[PDB]
Write a protein that binds this ligand. Structure first.
Ligand SMILES: [Ca+2]
Length: 80
């Protein structure tokens, strides 16, 4: 709606080397924030070299999720 207040989108994070996770995260988080939250939820150590791929493309860690093309129920790949 006009002037809506919704903060969250749900994302599926698939990982070939770690636990897949479905997260509901604020769209004002950065991609780095999303990675940090993934890591605390699945209990792996956060590192600068972890990346998220969306449709074949690396997401910029410094972009807000809202600034990317991610939408609710999208899926991304975690590359460790
Ligand atoms: Ca997995």
């Amino acid at each position: 709606h006009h002037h809506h207040h919704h903060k969250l989108i749900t994302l599926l994070l698939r990982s070939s080397k770690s636990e897949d996770l479905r997260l509901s995260i604020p769209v004002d988080f950065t991609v780095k924030d999303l990675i940090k939250r993934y890591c605390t939820e699945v209990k792996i150590s956060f590192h600068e070299r972890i990346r998220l791929e969306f449709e074949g493309e690396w997401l910029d860690p410094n972009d807000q999720v809202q600034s990317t093309e991610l939408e609710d129920e999208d899926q991304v790949s975690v590359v460790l």
